[PDB]
């Protein structure tokens, strides 16, 4: 309690209480001060099929995560086995479509990452609270069978999708291609107050295994690919999707080289 | 300063100071509380020839108010007399173009309105500061000579333009045509503080003779006419839809009134 | 009988009778002289549902007179009552469509005018014959119930339509809008001759209640409205007809003002 | 002047003088009777290098008559001999372009026709005035050397052009191609009157050797070919449809005639 | 046998036999020398309804020869009688469509020509072999009944079609129109060798009745007509075919003249 | 010269000399036999800065071979070192642009290939002439520093370009991308004759280290990528499809190889 800065604050409040057109009591002024202090501090502070899979070409398959629900992990692993069965053999390449993914259940994201990782860190949260610092490590099981995969990210890829993509990139397990990410990582917790009300505050932030903050740096793809049209000068979705076709061709070339 | 609720405010502030991700000192929190208390209360709170006239048709004339400057009143009356000289007789109809008018000198606004009014109120402000209340009533002289007029108002007509239009409508002196108005009918005074700083606060707001606040209600035209361009298959009504509509209304009103 | 001018005429006739390629007798030359004297004097001299009504909008109705037949008057009055019944109340505005109206029975036109007029003159014919001068006055009954109406006139509006429009305008009962009128008013009578034949001659002309000749001045609308297209910069026939939409909007504005 | 029918005429004139709306004196009525007697009888009654030639193909040549001037005959014969020199031998076919030819000097027309005729009539006029009859017969010399020719006639070919074309057709000397002709085959003489004025009257009209009047029948081509433009996927037949048709007809006629 | 030139040849052959990359024996070198000697000498040397007829307009008929098969002659004569029966009278004009005709049986071509010819030569082959010189004369029977005909030839008109067209043109029996001909006339005979193989050689060439070689000069139409579109400035196939329409109009004009 | 088959050849030649339409002497037949024996055997038989480099992205560089001149080797090594200096460190990927390369100095080709190879064969020629066999093996120095590279080949890449590309592919040193190559892998020597004339004969042909003939097989790229243009919605990969594909393949290969 500074008291002198509180004097300045109360003086401004009294001037407002005196001059404003419509009369205002002390309580509404205090509440507006609180709401604005939170608004000025942090914008987030206050006071259905998940997975679709398909074998797009012989040897090369496509797995899209529309959203991160609770069942999402089991569904991605189910789809992995299903794609292995559809190709009637081991897969030559996989495309993770994580674009247009707002986020969702963090644990489901970590288990989706666990389908591709056998060791190492996945994501960790850092803040100044005791119960904020949280680490997540990969289990020694990956239903992916080390399949080479390229992950697609758009601007509308945020939160859990961004966590998954950053984990897969920092582990050098996947090729990230597409445009940059929404760059938002935060964990708002609701804190209780002695008054009969509570306040929501960002208490910590997500960090990828390397250590880059998702909130600030975002996730930068290893290959930048904007939407574009190719003109030759000589179901099947890649005939209409430029980014998916590019990912498919990159996987094909990687398989040929290897 | 009621210390009992000050306990609640300081406790909320301390909880925020404790929980936020990146540390923030007391000074920035208090400053943001001030800025938000002003911001949450009021969006306005913080811490060229004026008139051009023309006779559109024999008997029907057009008077445009680009802006409200000091010369505006004198120029409006000069233009009124000049238009009476142009038609070589009394006018059958007049159009006040108050569209695209941000406002200007309030006294010039009351002078423009007073050119059309012989009695009654023009505008009055209401607020809680000592010397804010100012009323404006019409003097018993109108250079308009009781000509029937249509006033055109769009969205980009605010402040003094809205005072003039609202006075003309509530006094049942003119017919308002066009779309709705901006609705900026508030006055902001700069108040000084014991600290070497000041705050802008709305201290009063404008009211039309009826009693309707311009700040909220704005001024709603009697006939809604959106902007459009007419193409026949100088004379501005041949190109301006709203002006053509007002002119035709005045002509029909004159014919019926025989 | 000038005799000397007849000498000149007979001399020219004899020269023609002598020199022309194919021989011509005196009779055909005389007949051609007559036909040309009439042709040179006056071009008019020689020798099916009528009414459709509809309530276009709540309060505002539309009455078109395709042509002036004998039943036309009773049909317009029938339609007046029918439109009053359709609106389930008194009418706010009416549009008389008299454009594309060649004319027809004069008495039917005068009775159509009588549906809107309670007193005063309607039309009068003037000529130099005893039985040519004819006056027509309004009866004290108007099924219109003083409804404000706008009358539409095109270039193809002539004869009885022009009489109706001129009567309604000079009585200051209707608003005439659209383009100018065919400007034709005449009354050709057939006159008998001692020879077994007759000649048709314009014997008199129509005059509106004011006294303007319809044949020369035509009928000038109070508001000139050519065909045009409006472009917004933000059954139901007026959505396709520009003149009808303009008349509707003028009636709406007049109702709002009144 | 048969006074008995003059009674009928004067009585009709007096009835008209009595009945017409605006009064008219006897003089204007008599003058209009004169003007109409002439007008109703006859529409014509009231009160640059000439030739260009070219050899289109080896053996086939083209001769155009822009107008009929005095030099026209000499120039046509000069062009005939010159075209024989151009082909270095007798011609297989010739095209007379008489299209877009208003007419001109009649004697030049008979000279142009006489360049193709060795015997028979060319043109003769019939009328009822003393010295009108003029006949034109061919002399036993033709510089054309009996070359088969097609003559082209359009609507804008009148008077002397039609005389030439009709002579060539009725003498079975040429094949006419194109559309129909104007049909202006009448001569107007100015006749003087005892009054200081005169009248234009058609005094005779032209007749082709067959006996058909040019004024009414015109000249109808043996082959109807409308105007058109051909575009291949100088040589004017490559651009002119009618000329190309005439040229191809001449070529085929030459091949068959072997 | 020059022996010295054979020495030069054998010396070049031995140099080739020694230096070439892949080893080659004497036999393949000799065979390649033979094949190239023939290739360098002459490109041709080495080592289904036929007829469709229709009466296109009253009096004017169309006969197309798709190809020259054995039955072709009887079929053209059958079609001649059929067209005479269809028109219900003698024919005014006929169009032979020989364009897009590769050729075929020579005898069938000569009999097709015999349907239009009553005397004279048709085609004769000239070469330096005893049994090569061959003449073909017309029989005194023509089922055409002397009908005037125009023959159409394109660039893709060769061999027997070209023979027919040349015969009809040189006899001055038909009008050839269209573009030039493939210009190919040859008769390759297979000659036997003492070795168990044979060689095909052009042994003679075709000549039209005039004597022009078909192989070199080709067949030049009397009227050149490329594909084009006509634009008026005022089943039935000729409405779509320019060349056929031109041939039809030429036949019509020829009939009118005759 | 085996006279027994010479009998067959001379007999065939005499039969041709006898049967052909136009007479031909023995000399022209023998000359054509020579020209065809060479022509039927072999189509080739009868009787500017070289390198430009650029670093496309941090770590990834581009080296283009316009042509194979003498300076080419020195310039390629200079550019390699310069690109290492440009990236300020070892390169992650390199692109050899061998497209649109006709060939050039063979020794420069072996020098360009030797800049990437440390051991093994580069190219060897096989033929039947005494001094044709020339082999080229790599020296144990490679200025490339084992950088992974993709080589681009199109159809217009022949001769030395194909030698370089084939060496790089068969040594499993580079990944070939693009379309197939020209396939011109043959050497022509001019051989002199006892007559004052000479013959061009292919004396040997090129072979890649695997043993595949370049003349027939050409060089088939490991990844087929046709030419195309990309348009985003200097940096040449932003405009070149094949180069962009190679760059993205190199980037993905680098990420996987971590």
Author numbering:
A (entry chain B), C (entry chain B), E (entry chain B): 41 to 87, 191 to 377, 411 to 434
B (entry chain A), D (entry chain A), F (entry chain A): 41 to 87, 191 to 376, 411 to 435
Relevant lines from the article:
Pseudomonas aeruginosa CtpA is a carboxyl-terminal processing protease that partners with the outer membrane lipoprotein LbcA to degrade at least five cell wall-associated proteins, four of which are cell wall hydrolases. Instead, it requires the adaptor protein LbcA, the lipoprotein-binding partner of CtpA, for activity in vivo and in vitro. Therefore, it appears that LbcA interacts with CtpA to assemble an active proteolytic complex, which controls the activity of these enzymes by degrading them. We show that CtpA alone assembles as an inactive trimer of dimers and that LbcA is a right-handed spiral that might wrap around a substrate protein.
We solved the crystal structure of CtpA that was catalytically inactive due to an S302A substitution and found that it was also in the inactive configuration. (A) overall structure of CtpA(S302A) in ribbons, with the catalytic triad residues in sticks and the point mutation S302A in red sticks. The addition of purified LbcA was able to activate the protease of wild-type CtpA but not of the mutant CtpA(S302A). For comparison, the catalytic triad Ser-309–Lys-334–Gln-338 in the protease-active B. subtilis CtpB are all within hydrogen-bonding distance. Therefore, unlike CtpB, which fluctuates between an active and inactive form in solution and can be activated by a protein substrate, the CtpA hexamer is locked in an inactive configuration and requires LbcA for activation.
